[PDB]
RNA sequence: CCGCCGCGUGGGACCGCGCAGCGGGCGCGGCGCGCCGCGGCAGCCCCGAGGAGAGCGGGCGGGGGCACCGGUACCGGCCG
């Protein structure tokens, strides 16, 4: 239903020599650099994360611009329990939006697995979210830190900052 | 304005309870009761308390019970 499927679908045809991605979704960075959120229905994320970087590395070489990020799509509700007037209807913790946030987290940086959380309150400013990350990868990921607080803030409100440690 | 543990509206932070799929067609204005696809759902488990309980390994100890057993010494008897 636009013009980066195309494209995207053409690589995936190039790339092997049965998987399907449900949309696209493209978020704009400080930089003219642009990033863009490759949406993978959730039972199947698991098997595009067997070889996640180099897709995401043939991904960015066949077409550049912005940087390419695989992601899962997930549901949310806004009901413990749901009263159909007769019998008790509970909401599955998974569908909850803090388990959410944190399955996104982990799923934006799948290959580096996060050490650690810690949330700021300063005495005026907005309280921000600031992770921490190995310090062996380090510049491995260091020119992609900017785009993943971009899209963090775009799929969550919550703003967000990196560290290594 | 002032003798209310009752009555209605709103908020729902704190306070404590909610085991028994969903959605659509049959199907009638609506709810039941059943009958039909899974063909529409991401179907259906927070976590693992410097709380507790269970488990494996290691040594630790005048901790408990039963049987068994040595040593002088007090006392009594006897030979010289």
Same mark, same amino acid.
């Given at each position: 239903?636009?013009? #980066?499927? %195309?494209? !995207?679908?053409?690589?995936?045809?190039?790339?092997?020599?049965?998987?399907?991605?449900?949309?696209?979704?493209?978020?704009?960075?400080?930089?003219?650099?642009?990033?863009?959120? !490759?949406?993978? &229905?959730? &039972?199947?994320? $698991?098997?595009? $994360?067997?070889?996640?970087?180099?897709?995401?590395? %043939? #991904?960015? %070489?066949?077409?550049?611009?912005?940087?390419?990020?695989?992601?899962? =799509?997930?549901?949310?509700?806004?009901?413990? @329990?749901?009263?159909?007037?007769?019998?008790?209807?509970?909401? &599955?913790?998974? *569908?909850?939006?803090?388990?959410?946030? =944190?399955?996104? #987290?982990?799923?934006?940086? @799948?290959?580096?697995?996060?050490?650690? %959380?810690?949330?700021?309150?300063?005495?005026?400013? =907005? &309280? *921000?979210? $600031? !992770?921490?990350?190995?310090?062996? !990868?380090? =510049?491995?990921?260091?020119?992609?830190?900017?785009? @993943?607080?971009?899209? @963090?803030?775009? #799929?969550?409100?919550?703003?967000?900052?990196?560290?290594?440690?």
């Amino acid at each position: 239903l636009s013009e #980066l499927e %195309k494209q !995207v679908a053409g690589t995936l045809l190039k790339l092997e020599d049965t998987l399907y991605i449900s949309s696209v979704k493209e978020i704009a960075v400080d930089g003219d650099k642009k990033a863009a959120v !490759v949406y993978v &229905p959730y &039972p199947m994320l $698991q098997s595009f $994360q067997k070889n996640s970087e180099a897709l995401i590395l %043939k #991904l960015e %070489k066949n077409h550049s611009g912005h940087r390419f990020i695989i992601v899962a =799509n997930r549901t949310i509700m806004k009901n413990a @329990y749901v009263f159909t007037g007769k019998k008790s209807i509970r909401r &599955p913790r998974s *569908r909850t939006m803090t388990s959410v946030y =944190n399955c996104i #987290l982990d799923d934006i940086c @799948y290959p580096i697995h996060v050490i650690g %959380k810690r949330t700021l309150y300063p005495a005026g400013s =907005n &309280p *921000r979210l $600031q !992770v921490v990350l190995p310090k062996a !990868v380090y =510049n491995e990921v260091s020119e992609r830190t900017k785009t @993943y607080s971009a899209v @963090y803030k775009a #799929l969550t409100e919550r703003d967000t900052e990196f560290i290594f440690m």
